[PDB]
């Protein structure tokens, strides 16, 4: 029944820039400064940045500034750094004798902008061990690139594949703001042993032209 | 010195129950609010409730009342008992002291699917590796359930250039992921690389040696 609306859902800025995040509450927090701001990186617990609306938690740099009171609060992150790539949350606490005691905002993803960086591409054949089990996994790695958008195409004896691959992308790197990506092609052992040339073709803004990594089954 | 640690998570059947425990270290409770927060995979934080450790008084989110019970059985533990569990309850569960000291979380997965340990396959360095350049190698951790798995390299001695990808759920309902690392192409024939895979939910530990073929 408490409603804490956090905006925007996502925001991007370059290193050194400023990002502004707002939370608006239907009811006033209690007391009027009882709100906290959190930073969360993947696989970690959230980290308190600011409590009592504007009080810095230990060790948190001063470019994180909280403001507001009652039903309207703002987190302003200035002098942005690569390390600020994360999801941020507000949390309000309320008079629990008359309503729900707490509520989180919906979160804000911060993306750090940087210069274009081309991926280094690698291709991996399936292991002999896996082939014994009747399935073949072919893996294509796109390493340390920016921006996130990239097109991966599998060709098997020059025949474009569709429907038999899945991609996984890392979170934006905390030190250089790049991404890495894996595309895994899944084939039966029977189908795998019907063809010779396995190729991963990568199109990305940072490449002067599409890059192809290939191997011949057997060599 | 002060820490919190959640335990008791794992795989549980739909409509089942589970009790989580939050254990304090380096301090004991003295009239504080111990709280439970959860986060479904890829989603936001969601408050469950808090308990006042001196009075035992409890305060819950409206959605959680009745189904979730927070108790305080000792000066260093609180528990979260959860009933009539559903897929919507699959999440990492965190305990926190006044929302500022946090445990690392523990994963609860609500499913009828079986526990299954992964297979580990090498992603071998390419023989076409450019000699004055960089080579990539890795490990494919295939067909496991539930989350999570961890991967380290050379038992933790190798971290620079390591990327362990988010797991992908296959149509089979099993997860797979790859973990990769980049090294100087001239370190291939002289250096040994081993990925250390741990799938604690199935009691599976595998060390795979990755070498050129």
């Amino acid at each position: 029944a408490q409603v804490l609306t956090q905006t925007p859902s996502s925001v991007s800025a370059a290193v050194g820039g400023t990002v502004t995040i707002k939370c608006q509450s239907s009811q006033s927090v209690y007391p009027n400064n009882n709100l906290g701001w959190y930073q969360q990186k993947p696989g970690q617990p959230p980290k308190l940045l600011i409590y009592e609306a504007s009080t810095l938690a230990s060790g948190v740099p001063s470019r994180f500034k909280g403001s507001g009171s009652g039903t309207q609060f703002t987190l302003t992150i200035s002098d942005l750094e690569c390390d600020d790539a994360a999801t941020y949350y507000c949390l309000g606490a309320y008079d629990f004798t008359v309503a729900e005691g707490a509520a989180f905002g919906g979160g804000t993803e911060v993306v750090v902008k940087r210069t274009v960086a081309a991926p280094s591409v690698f291709i991996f054949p399936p292991s002999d061990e896996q082939l014994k089990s009747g399935t073949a996994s072919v893996v294509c790695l796109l390493n340390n690139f920016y921006p996130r958008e990239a097109k991966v195409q599998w060709k098997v004896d020059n025949a474009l594949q569709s429907g038999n691959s899945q991609e996984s992308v890392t979170e934006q790197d905390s030190k250089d703001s790049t991404y890495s990506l894996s595309s895994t092609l899944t084939l039966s052992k029977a189908d795998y042993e019907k063809h010779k040339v396995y190729a991963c073709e990568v199109t990305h803004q940072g490449l002067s032209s599409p890059v192809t990594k290939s191997f011949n089954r057997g060599e | 010195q002060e820490q919190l640690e959640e335990s008791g998570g794992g795989l549980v059947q739909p409509e089942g129950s589970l009790t989580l425990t939050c254990k304090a270290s380096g301090f004991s409770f003295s009239a504080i609010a111990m709280c439970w927060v959860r986060q479904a995979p890829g989603k936001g934080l969601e408050w469950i409730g808090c308990i006042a450790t001196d009075t035992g008084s409890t305060y819950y989110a409206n959605w959680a009342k009745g189904r979730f019970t927070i108790s305080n059985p000792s000066s260093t533990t609180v528990t979260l008992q959860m009933t009539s569990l559903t897929a919507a309850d699959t999440a990492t569960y965190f305990c926190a002291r006044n929302f500022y000291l946090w445990g690392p979380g523990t994963l609860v997965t609500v499913s009828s699917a079986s526990t299954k340990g992964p297979s580990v396959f090498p992603l071998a360095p390419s023989s076409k590796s450019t000699s004055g350049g960089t080579a990539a190698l890795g490990c494919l951790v295939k067909d496991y359930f539930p989350e999570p798995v961890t991967v380290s390299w050379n038992s933790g001695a190798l971290t620079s250039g390591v990327h362990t990808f988010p797991a992908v759920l296959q149509s089979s309902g099993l997860y797979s992921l790859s973990s990769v690392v980049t090294v100087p192409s001239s370190s291939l024939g002289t250096q040994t690389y081993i990925c250390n895979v741990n799938h604690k939910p199935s009691n599976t530990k595998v060390d795979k040696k990755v070498e050129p073929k």
């Binding site: 209690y30 007391p31 | 609010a33 709280c35 808090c50 006044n98 929302f99």
Partner: peptide
């Protein structure tokens, strides 16, 4: 008497 949970270190309520 207690009316709310204090977010952050210090007082708990």
């Amino acid at each position: 008497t207690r009316k709310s949970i204090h977010i952050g270190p210090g007082r708990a309520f």
